[PDB]
């Protein structure tokens, strides 16, 4: 199991513009297109991201290309962030995937905001960090997915995904 297969399970694959949990226009593997309510603003962004006139439909390869970009952008955002970098460096390889996961879903600004949990992660206080992360809008809105991520963090194993 690795970050890519982990995120593909959490996000799924959709080749046609869809709306995410929050209602935003998305496509492929959790690739957010726009927060705007306009389906046209969405097609527009989609064509911009792909480099062709898509009419809201992409191929698997296109979806996988956006996905590779986004995981890389996720890792780089963590290593560039003064709040995140230190937690990340401190963690084992499994735990690292889990923070990448959070960052992919919520953006670096958002995860950087979980101040207390990051501090408990850095101190390797696994159970307490788990209890604290669950006290969030995140957990309340996408509980099955949060649970899995949280579990990866608490245990350092891929159990939740197997
Ligand atoms: Cl893009
Ligand atoms: Cl969920």
From Swiss-Prot:
Effect of residue 20 to A/N/S/T: Complete loss of enzymatic activity
BP GO terms, sorted: cell wall macromolecule catabolic process; defense response to bacterium; peptidoglycan catabolic process; viral release from host cell by cytolysis
Effect ascribed to mutating residue 117 to V: 50-fold decrease in enzymatic activity
Effect of mutating residue 132 to M/F: 2-fold decrease in enzymatic activity
This protein's record includes keyword Methyltransferase: no
Active site: 11 (proton donor/acceptor), 20 (proton donor/acceptor)
Family: Belongs to the glycosyl hydrolase 24 family.
Protein name in the entry: Endolysin
Natural source organism: Enterobacteria phage T4
